């Protein structure tokens, strides 16, 4: 059985049980989105840090729109180890991404970074981890709608 962990659907603030250990960004909340406003020259990131425990492998599902290129990473904060999941091209419309996490350590941080460091906004909603793969992902969000 896959375990689906909904981190947030609509956000009005930081997800419950998480902190932001990122840098070089201002966050705001509107239309249910976490709106990341990175500062120019900082290669800013949100780093969602789980207060307790860790995820392992599996996959990350989220809706995003983004004015520039966005790098997705995870980290294990104990080993001080970081892993690049994917780099995602700009889109002016929300797109649903479901990405395998092939990191061979547990991860307690999930990062969205303004990779080019030009200060391009990022918008995120509906962020979910599965213990199962991307191909096998059955979206609980689309599914609750239907």
Burial of 104 by CB count in 10 Å (0-12 exposed, 13-18 middle, 19+ buried)?
exposed
> Given its phi and psi angles, is residue 41 left (phi above 0), alpha (psi -120 to 50 degrees) or beta?
left
Q: Cα dihedral angle (45, 49, 55, 60), rounded to 10 degrees? A: -40
Neighbours of 29 (CB within 10 A): 13
Q: How far apart are CA 71 and CA 51, in angstroms?
A: 23
Q: Where are the domains of the chain?
A: 1-146
Sign of the Cα torsion 12, 15, 19, 23 reads negative
Burial of 71 by CB count in 10 Å (0-12 exposed, 13-18 middle, 19+ buried)?
middle
SS3 per-residue string spanning the chain = CCCEEEEECCCCCCCCCEEECCECEEEEEECCEEEEEECCCCCCEEEEEECCCCECCCEEEEEEEECCCEEEEEEECCCCEEEEEEEECCEEEEEEEEEECCCCCCECEEEEEECCCCCCCEEEEEEEEECCCCCCCCCHHHHHHC
Q: Tell me if 52 sits within 8 A of 59, measured CB to CB.
A: no
Q: Tell me if 58 sits within 8 A of 98, measured CB to CB.
A: no
Q: 67: closest CA among 35, 33, 41, 20?
A: 35
CATH topology of domain 1-146: Jelly Rolls (2.60.120)
Q: Tell me if 109 sits within 8 A of 51, measured CB to CB.
A: no
Token digits of residue 63:
């809706």
Neighbours of 31 (CB within 10 A): 9
Q: Tell me if 9 sits within 8 A of 125, measured CB to CB.
A: yes
């Amino acid at each position: 059985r896959a375990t689906y962990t909904v981190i947030f659907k609509n956000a009005s603030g930081l997800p419950n049980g998480y902190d932001n250990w990122g840098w070089g960004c201002t966050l705001s909340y509107y239309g249910g989105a976490m709106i990341i406003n990175p500062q120019e020259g900082k290669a800013g990131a949100v780093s969602l840090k789980r207060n307790s425990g860790s995820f392992r492998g599996g996959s990350l599902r989220f809706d995003m729109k983004n004015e520039g290129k966005v790098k997705i990473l995870v980290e294990n904060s104990e080993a001080d180890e970081k892993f690049e999941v994917e780099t995602i091209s700009p889109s002016d419309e929300y797109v649903t991404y479901i990405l395998d996490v092939d990191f061979d350590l547990p991860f307690d941080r999930i990062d969205f970074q303004d990779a080019p460091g030009n200060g391009d906004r990022i918008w995120i909603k509906n962020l979910v981890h599965s213990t199962g793969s991307a191909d096998d992902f059955v979206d609980p969000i689309n599914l609750e709608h239907h």
